[PDB]
Amino acid sequence: SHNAQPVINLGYARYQGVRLEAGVDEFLGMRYASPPIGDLRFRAPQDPPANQTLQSATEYGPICIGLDEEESPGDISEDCLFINVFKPSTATSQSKLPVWLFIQGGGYAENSNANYNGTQVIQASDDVIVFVTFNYRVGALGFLASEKVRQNGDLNAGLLDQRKALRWVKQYIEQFGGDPDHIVIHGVSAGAGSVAYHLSAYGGKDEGLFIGAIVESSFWPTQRTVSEMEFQFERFVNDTGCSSARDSLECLREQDIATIQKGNTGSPFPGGSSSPLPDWYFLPVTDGSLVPDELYNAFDAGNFIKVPVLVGDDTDEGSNFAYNASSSADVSRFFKNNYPNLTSQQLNEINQVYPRGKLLPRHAAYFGASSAAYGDATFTCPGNHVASSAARYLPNSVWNYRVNIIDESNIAGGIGVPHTFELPAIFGAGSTGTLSSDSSYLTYNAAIIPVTMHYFISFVQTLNPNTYRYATAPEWNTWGNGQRLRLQTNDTAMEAVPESSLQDCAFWKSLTVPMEV
Ligand SMILES: *[C@@H]1O[C@H](CO)[C@@H](O[C@@H]2O[C@H](CO)[C@@H](O[C@@H]3O[C@H](CO)[C@@H](O)[C@H](O)[C@@H]3O)[C@H](O)[C@H]2NC(C)=O)[C@H](O)[C@H]1NC(C)=O
Ligand SMILES: *[C@@H]1O[C@H](CO)[C@@H](O)[C@H](O)[C@H]1NC(C)=O
Ligand SMILES: *[C@@H]1O[C@H](CO)[C@@H](O)[C@H](O)[C@H]1NC(C)=O
Ligand SMILES: *[C@@H]1O[C@H](CO)[C@@H](O)[C@H](O)[C@H]1NC(C)=O
Ligand SMILES: [Cl-]
Fold first, then answer.
1. Which residue ranges form the domains of the chain, and what is each CATH number?
2. How far is the CA of 18 from the centre of ligand 1 (A)?
3. Is 448 left (phi over 0), alpha (psi -120 to 50) or beta?
4. Distance CA 63, CA 76 (A)
5. Residue 91 and residue 97 in contact, taking contact as beta carbons nearer than 8 Å
6. Catalytic positions, please?
7. Distance between CA atoms of 475 and 472, rounded to whole angstroms?
8. d(CA 386, CA 383)
9. What spacing in Å lies between the alpha carbon of 6 and ligand 5's midpoint?
């Protein structure tokens, strides 16, 4: 029945997938690594087990259990290292189609863009691309950091999962009709920060894993050293009831997931106050190998792979994440608690660059400032830095965007054009989860979907968003001296980055040392 129920033979395993009437075949819940359980907890991913029994690929595996989450059979689990492939039904191993490899976000704390459907993008491409998604470890399980982890385990395990998945696609995607020599990686949010790590991995040697990158809302939170995370390891050991054990790591590896989850929770960094808790707690660290340096430094040095880049951000990146500040002091306490090496003087300077501002609906008087400052510090300025850095080497192949899709209910919520709001415009309404009945994507923002989707597909296929852009969409010019496409329903056009934003990014740039970014 492989002429009807598609089977793919990868040698180590054979998977039976699903054929859709859409002319797309799906292979869901394939293993790209061994379950990271027992002794493999807090270790690099290992090869998936060879298995001669037919494997079902008709259903998603669970996503990776993250910070403050609860195990749920089939839904959320430690056993979560799965990869999923969508391909045109007619494609064979000889097809050699461009591959779109999607890396989900979730702040390194959760898997927050999991199981996205590639059917609509494949159909919109006229059936000549392959789409890939996967889960990687997060929270304590993906990002426990200590000399003790590193001496009997591996740092940045969650990013090492991503490396394993990238290598899995390189080794196996040919069997799904993909071209292993034509992979584009696309990261959103923490996945976009991950893309920056993949570009700069080990200092930037091209391992031939991808020929282009989409960086959708960079997320660059504090990136601390191993010694700066010892407090966190010790606290985790305490919370899980493991403090009296001689071998801390062995004891951690014996605890059941429910026990682990007691420590898989946020608390203040040293130097931070009791509230607010940092937005993000378990995080990528400088590990001296995969991650030899801070991202800002590595992109300054040119220590990254020179491939075409599509990179951008929303108008109000910070809106879902910034402290609901009532005062200048609230803004400073928020920043100090997320970047505890900022000085009293640097905090005051932040308040001068981002003063109080217009009142936003449903938020306190200083929330506009909090949100603008945090959006710039953590998302947009990093994105602009990626663009300008890559453009030094490939000025003809670096494209920047600003998403300014206006949704009335976002505006009434005081969140402006929030972080990753364009996701359904890239993948199609319904592809990223069920939309509300009144979603503007089904009404007055419908028209931005074909436009956005076509640019992204075009870049995946040809490394230029213009080649197969939507029929009436404008030409998207490269970064140049700071130029970007504004994506907005009925109002999409090139615009200059204002001198004032470039100045604000130079301000954040002057603070990369205390912020550790
Ligand atoms: C991704 O999105 C596509 C739609 O864009 C989803 O495809 C639809 O999938 C459903 C099943 O969930 C199909 O309906 C089933 O059809 C079979 C075959 O006749 C029948 O046995 C069942 O009774 C049921 O009706 C539907 O035909 C299909 N639509 C198209 C246009 O192909 C797909 O399920 C989504 N994939 C994932 C993983 O969510
Ligand atoms: C082999 O795969 C089959 C089918 O999924 C499964 O039943 C079985 O548990 C696997 N065997 C081992 C030892 O992993
Ligand atoms: C923001 O603070 C104001 C006043 O303290 C309050 O009424 C509102 O509920 C808060 N909003 C959020 C998003 O927490
Ligand atoms: C875009 O223009 C179309 C056609 O006039 C309309 O349906 C839609 O409401 C407009 N959307 C916005 C946000 O203006
Ligand atoms: Cl067959």
1. 1-517 (3.40.50.1820)
2. 9
3. alpha
4. 5
5. yes
6. 189
7. 9
8. 5
9. 8
